[PDB]
Design a protein around this ligand. Structure first.
Ligand SMILES: Cc1nnc2ccc(-c3cnn(C)c3Oc3ccccc3)nn12
Length: 127
């Protein structure tokens, strides 16, 4: 039932880069999904206490959310685009693992994932 510490958004010894693909992931991918009508549940880590989901963190061992992704992109935490893409995929997968098909939260994740795939399809080549 307690909430774990949120995923790491700062790590000075972790190598980082600012590239055109990571810039695209913030400016295009991370803005398009953030502004969506169904973004709200995914804008911060899941609060297992407030949401009365005591089982959440016993099932979801790799939690992820757009709030964490936002901070990671803004504070230049990533080395490459694949690390960021993996975070988005982890967020959607966690939602599908914890919930059942047709659930409101699953429908919300599906709408965001559709857009995510549309935008990632246009990921620019590395400069
Ligand atoms: C379940 C479940 N599985 N992953 C997640 C991630 C976030 C949230 C979340 C955030 N705020 N509130 C009130 C939440 O609950 C719901 C429940 C149904 C629809 C919308 C939100 N729920 N959630």
């Amino acid at each position: 039932s307690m909430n774990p510490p949120p995923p790491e958004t700062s790590n000075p010894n972790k190598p980082k880069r600012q590239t055109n693909q990571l810039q695209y992931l913030l400016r295009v991918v991370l803005k398009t999904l953030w502004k969506h009508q169904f973004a709200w549940p995914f804008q911060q880590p899941v609060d297992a206490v407030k949401l009365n989901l005591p089982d959440y963190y016993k099932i979801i061992k790799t939690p992820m959310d757009m709030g964490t992704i936002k901070k990671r992109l803004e504070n230049n935490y990533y080395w490459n685009a694949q690390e960021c893409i993996q975070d988005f995929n982890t967020m959607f997968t966690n939602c599908y693992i914890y919930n059942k098909p047709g659930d409101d939260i699953v429908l919300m994740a599906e709408a965001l994932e559709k857009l995510f795939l549309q935008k990632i399809n246009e990921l620019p080549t590395e400069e």
